[PDB]
Amino acid sequence: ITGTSTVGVGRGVLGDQKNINTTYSTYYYLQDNTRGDGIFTYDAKYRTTLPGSLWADADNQFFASYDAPAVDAHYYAGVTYDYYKNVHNRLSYDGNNAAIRSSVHYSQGYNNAFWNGSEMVYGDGDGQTFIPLSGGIDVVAHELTHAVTDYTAGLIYQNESGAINEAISDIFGTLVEFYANKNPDWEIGEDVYTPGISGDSLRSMSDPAKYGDPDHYSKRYTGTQDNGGVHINSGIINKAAYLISQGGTHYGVSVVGIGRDKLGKIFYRALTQYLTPTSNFSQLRAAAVQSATDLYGSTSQEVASVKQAFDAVGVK
Ligand SMILES: [Ca+2]
Ligand SMILES: [Ca+2]
Ligand SMILES: [Ca+2]
Ligand SMILES: [Ca+2]
Ligand SMILES: [Zn+2]
């Protein structure tokens, strides 16, 4: 839409009030012109046809319960854009300020969110397992990071390369959550998962085995479900990333933590410079060691901690 940039106000899925960037042209649209070529949020109207209609509002106030998933999809896409720009010098997911598009109210009772190769898509959940999935900033940043991966390393979505793909999205989803300082943790999806149960989440990076995911390469899933375990074996890499950042002793191997900022720098360099579509876990280790070497030197603590973390999860 062509029109005038303005700022509206609304309430997100968790009931918090926030300001959002909109565009005025007869209606107020969820179109943010302040970031790249724009952030656009669409209403899929409980259907599966995409993208749906660009979100239009009569008064620039978004306090209806129907509005909430749109507010959060729109706002958290902006935060994720800001993260990649300010921290990694990356302009949107393609590096050239591509427009970011999201559709909310996808289908009925849909307990998931995804990047479809062109846009982000959020279900509303069924009210029991999930509430609308854009309510989690780690979820939004997880999905948008799939777009970054698609335009850089291109990791194919199966077997070890796919598990790496998933882990990269969990890792940067978590780093974005820390960047926004929104009650940050090392869990995935806790804000929108099981509204009736407190303290849980979909996945854990600190302790993947909490929810039955492997935390060591010896426990990797080798069958054919879930595209060869892409959401399962990501736990091995998530645990390694958690160890690099926070440290700890895991299966008797001790890791000195180097912090979240350096973890992000190492993995972003690995992703954008060294990983390829068919990279496996052992090539990820090599890429991460080389990235830390590039950034901090071959005799640094940083290189040593990357090596120890991968040793700890059994990835040689
Ligand atoms: Ca309104
Ligand atoms: Ca959190
Ligand atoms: Ca989280
Ligand atoms: Ca819960
Ligand atoms: Zn994913």
Numbering used by the authors: 1 to 316
Which text from the study accompanies this structure?
Examples are given of the equilibration of three different crystals to new solutions with exchange times ranging from 5 to 180 min. In each case direct transfer of the crystal to the new solution causes cracking, which is eliminated with gradient equilibration using the described device. Crystals equilibrated with the device produce high-quality diffraction that yields refined structures comparable to those determined previously.
For the lysozyme and thermolysin crystals, just a 5 min gradient was sufficient to prevent visible cracking, while α-lactalbumin benefitted from more gradual treatments.
